[PDB]
């Protein structure tokens, strides 16, 4: 049937319906910290989320998305390796069934409990749909999550998960400030890649933060109570919704720090 993260429709099967899965700039990848090249020309990231307007949270069957109003430059990302302004449209996570796995990118083969993806699109293209068709259409900020101390700013998201347990369910989710999900440092690694789930389009400039944020065991546990299935269907826990590392091939990972 359609793609998923199960044994018969998982990542290893995606290439049949989405040939680009075996493309030249697929994500995620393993970040070899010793092979990454420090680029002194990379500017600091500029995150302007003070005017962010969250609208809704939704379970789309692959993860849960927190959506924002992207009709104006309210929450934008600029600087770094980017040219122009990128508007935040949504953020979601990828996590595992155990604390030892869950992230998509890895650092020197190290896996984290989860990975947060803040998706932004290049305003020069007018809308998200047009942006995904361009090589510089999206900018995704990736943040690693490690299990330890609780993250206060994530609790509001955790508490509403019960209302969107199954696929297709959505709930009003206003006044959420994404700034509460950022680590102290904005040092990063960057490389040209793709969306990590179908359609797997190669339209992403990845910006992966070096510093992970910590969340508590209890917070991640609640992520694991979501369902891939829709209401009224056999229960399948939403866990391990991550794609394994792909070949770096003809690409170089640059670091903003040395």
25 near Zn ion (CB under 5 A) = no
- Ranked by CB distance to Zn ion, the top (closest) residue is 117
- Which CB, 117 or 210, lies closer to Zn ion? 117
The piece of 14-22, 113-121, 164-172, 186-194 that touches Zn ion (CB under 5 A) is 113-121
Considering only CA atoms, which of 144, 104, 86, 128 is closest in space to residue 240? 104
Q: What contacts 226, CB < 8 A, 6 or more positions away?
A: 59, 64, 161, 164, 165, 237, 238
- Which CB, 141 or 147, lies closer to Zn ion? 141
- Which CB, 35 or 142, lies closer to Zn ion? 142
User: What minimum distance in Å lies between the beta carbon of 94 and Zn ion?
Assistant: 5
Rounded distance between C-alpha atoms, residue 223 and residue 219, angstroms: 7
User: What minimum distance in Å lies between the beta carbon of 163 and Zn ion?
Assistant: 22
H or E, element range at 218: helix 217-223
The piece of 10-18, 34-42, 111-119, 199-207 that touches Zn ion (CB under 5 A) is 111-119
117 near Zn ion (CB under 5 A) = yes
User: What minimum distance in Å lies between the beta carbon of 176 and Zn ion?
Assistant: 18
User: What minimum distance in Å lies between the beta carbon of 196 and Zn ion?
Assistant: 5
The piece of 35-43, 116-124, 206-214, 229-237 that touches Zn ion (CB under 5 A) is 116-124
Q: Which residues of 211-245 are buried (b: 16+ CB within 10 A; e: fewer)?
A: ebbebeeebbebbbebbbbeeeeeeeebbbbbbeb
Rounded distance between C-alpha atoms, residue 114 and residue 112, angstroms: 6
- Which CB, 114 or 161, lies closer to Zn ion? 114
The piece of 4-12, 68-76, 117-125, 163-171 that touches Zn ion (CB under 5 A) is 117-125
The piece of 11-19, 114-122, 126-134, 212-220 that touches Zn ion (CB under 5 A) is 114-122
Cβ atoms 144, 213 nearer than 8 A: yes
Length of the chain: 258
Count of Cβ atoms closer than 10 Å to residue 74 Cβ: 16
Residues within the interface to Zn ion (CB under 5 A): 117
């Amino acid at each position: 049937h359609h793609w998923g993260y199960g044994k018969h429709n998982g990542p290893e099967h995606w290439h049949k319906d989405f040939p680009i899965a075996k493309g030249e700039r697929q994500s995620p990848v393993d970040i070899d910290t010793h092979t990454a090249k420090y680029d002194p020309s990379l500017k600091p990231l500029s995150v302007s989320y003070d005017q962010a307007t969250s609208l809704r949270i939704l379970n789309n069957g692959a993860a849960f998305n927190v959506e924002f109003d992207d009709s104006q430059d309210k929450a934008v990302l600029k600087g770094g390796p980017l040219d122009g302004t990128y508007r935040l449209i949504q953020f979601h996570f990828h996590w595992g069934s155990l604390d030892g796995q869950g992230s998509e990118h890895t650092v020197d083969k190290k896996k984290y409990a989860a990975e947060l993806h803040l998706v932004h699109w290049n305003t020069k293209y007018g809308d998200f749909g047009k942006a995904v068709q361009q090589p510089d259409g999206l900018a995704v900020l990736g943040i690693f999550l490690k299990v330890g101390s609780a993250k206060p700013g994530l609790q509001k998201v955790v508490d509403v998960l019960d209302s969107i347990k199954t696929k297709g369910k959505s709930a009003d989710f206003t006044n959420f400030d994404p700034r509460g999900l950022l680590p102290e440092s904005l040092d990063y690694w960057t490389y040209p890649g793709s969306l990590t789930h179908p359609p797997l389009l190669e339209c992403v400039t990845w910006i992966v933060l070096k510093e992970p944020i910590s969340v508590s065991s209890e917070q991640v546990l609640k992520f694991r109570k979501l369902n891939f299935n829709g209401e009224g269907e056999p229960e399948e826990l939403m866990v391990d919704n991550w794609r394994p590392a792909q070949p770096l091939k003809n690409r170089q990972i640059k670091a903003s720090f040395k």
